[PDB]
Design a binder for this molecule. Sequence first.
Ligand SMILES: CC1=C2O[C@@]3(C)CC[C@H]4C(C)(C)C(=O)CC[C@]4(C)[C@H]3C[C@]2(C)C2=C(C(=O)OC2)C1=O
Ligand SMILES: CC1=C2O[C@@]3(C)CC[C@H]4C(C)(C)C(=O)CC[C@]4(C)[C@H]3C[C@]2(C)C2=C(C(=O)OC2)C1=O
Ligand SMILES: O=C(O)CCC(=O)C(=O)O
Ligand SMILES: O=C(O)CCC(=O)C(=O)O
Ligand SMILES: [Fe+3]
Ligand SMILES: [Fe+3]
Lengths: 285, 285
Amino acid sequence: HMPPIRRVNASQGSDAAYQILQEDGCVIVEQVICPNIIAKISDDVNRVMDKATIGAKKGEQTHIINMHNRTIHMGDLVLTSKTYRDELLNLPFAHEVLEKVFKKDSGDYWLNMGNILNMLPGAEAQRPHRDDYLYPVSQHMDPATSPDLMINITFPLNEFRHDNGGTLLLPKSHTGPNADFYANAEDLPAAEMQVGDALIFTGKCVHGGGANRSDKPRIGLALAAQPGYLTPRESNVNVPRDIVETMTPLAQRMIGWGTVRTKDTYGLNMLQDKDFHEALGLKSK
Amino acid sequence: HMPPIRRVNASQGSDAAYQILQEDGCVIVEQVICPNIIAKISDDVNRVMDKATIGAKKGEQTHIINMHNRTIHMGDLVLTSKTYRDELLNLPFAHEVLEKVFKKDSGDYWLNMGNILNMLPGAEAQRPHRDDYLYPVSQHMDPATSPDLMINITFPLNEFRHDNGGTLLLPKSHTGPNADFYANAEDLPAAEMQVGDALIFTGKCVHGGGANRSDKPRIGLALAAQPGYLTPRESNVNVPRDIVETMTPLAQRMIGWGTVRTKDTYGLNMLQDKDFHEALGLKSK
Ligand SMILES: CC1=C2O[C@@]3(C)CC[C@H]4C(C)(C)C(=O)CC[C@]4(C)[C@H]3C[C@]2(C)C2=C(C(=O)OC2)C1=O
Ligand SMILES: CC1=C2O[C@@]3(C)CC[C@H]4C(C)(C)C(=O)CC[C@]4(C)[C@H]3C[C@]2(C)C2=C(C(=O)OC2)C1=O
Ligand SMILES: O=C(O)CCC(=O)C(=O)O
Ligand SMILES: O=C(O)CCC(=O)C(=O)O
Ligand SMILES: [Fe+3]
Ligand SMILES: [Fe+3]
């Protein structure tokens, strides 16, 4: 018996989605965002897609997730899309869920990164994995009781199905012990969904990209958030201060332009023994 | 039943110090740095003491270590002391020890912060604590088998004695379970050191600032390093790039101006899916 991927409409409230996410480790939330927003973001991203890296980045092994050369992962979305800085990073449903996940166990949260997941025609499935493997401390904690280190929110930019490689997930796989093998990709259900929908799964949910057996690319956008005490994979210190001061305080903290406090009230990422904003006089929308 | 704080001369090698720190959680290293280096750094620090905060920062609860107001902690040392930037951040003994601590279990390391510690006359002792309590994940890991999350190196800028509040340590206390009480500060040995020595202890070593019963301020310079995947308490994004470029690549990585790889080779603090330096074209020394 393989349990299916469960879905809620966003009009049912982020409590329903959060209860499915803590019982299964994954949930598809339908009609969570206006599809026109996503169309603008796909516009912006397609302009600059010819400048992205195919395969692994420099000096990173590829056998934990089966990182290969018919996928494109592209970052730097903050500079690429204003609609991303303005609409997506402030979506209140997403922050309702992320606050339910992170607030008591860890405190404030920010992005690990925002990432374009391009599964090219011909791309094979990845090895099912846990994303919290990125952080070494996660192997020294019991998954049944340890706090969540990562939450992934994936917005399909075109439609996700099984045949074009929509994300494969293993529901209810998020409490068991860490293992070097979990499942074969061919045994997992795919997250099927449309522009406007989002898939949400935790750093402990077993998942991976599927095989794109179609003749068009399958592209999603993944907002990955984590506790503020974990170092983001992507820094944003090179974003113009004048761009950053048109963003909201919450979104400025998301891209690392703000102090993050632990659930114990201690600040990380401070400037000159003060608040990040206070020390810079950083304005915001 | 109380073990003593063990010490070596830096001329006995980094490997001997490392052995003691592994058996005890703390080691005093004698004559590790020219006293003139520290003297210059202390003139630099004293010129700017009028801009420091006494006691807690805004919002940070105090009862876990007993932070009171006969105590001045002062960060922001990259812009205060040039000798700090050039000399202290490049001291080879320190990096040999931090390499032995961090490299297999975690990967690259960088500063939590460099912090001037001032126990003023009349300062009472702190409650003995473990420093890694700053990071919530430390409470979900078995101390006898889990990676080190922090190494503290403290240079006295004037003589540490018991009488003036020299750091109190519980040697061999670095493998026992986490507890909400470890010992009373009256029961602990003090670290007694000259300018030129250094105390090195880990984030699982039970310690605390002692009681300064003397007439003068007791001042040390703490250098707390942690794995690259933990968010530094102190950012350095407002150091002018011209200053940063006169530092070695190593010192640059220490103050957050570089990419940090985990032991599984994955990079963190990347810029544009590249190395921090490659994407900035950041020069160095
Ligand atoms: C564990 C592992 C990694 O960790 C994760 C999963 C964690 C975060 C994740 C998020 C959710 C942000 C995303 O959007 C897609 C992929 C990734 C960047 C990813 C990339 C990376 C470094 C990597 C690996 C490899 O093979 O090449 C690349 C790898 O094994
Ligand atoms: C756990 C705890 C904290 O964690 C530590 C110990 C960890 C790192 C440490 C280093 C070693 C860098 C240092 O140089 C001196 C003290 C401190 C900044 C310290 C400060 C802080 C946030 C805090 C506490 C409190 O009460 O106010 C402040 C507190 O209880
Ligand atoms: O492309 C996907 O659907 C999943 C991407 C992923 O899981 C990864 O590479 O970490
Ligand atoms: O002041 C000292 O000697 C110790 C300081 C300390 O342990 C702390 O505040 O974390
Ligand atoms: Fe993944
Ligand atoms: Fe301490």
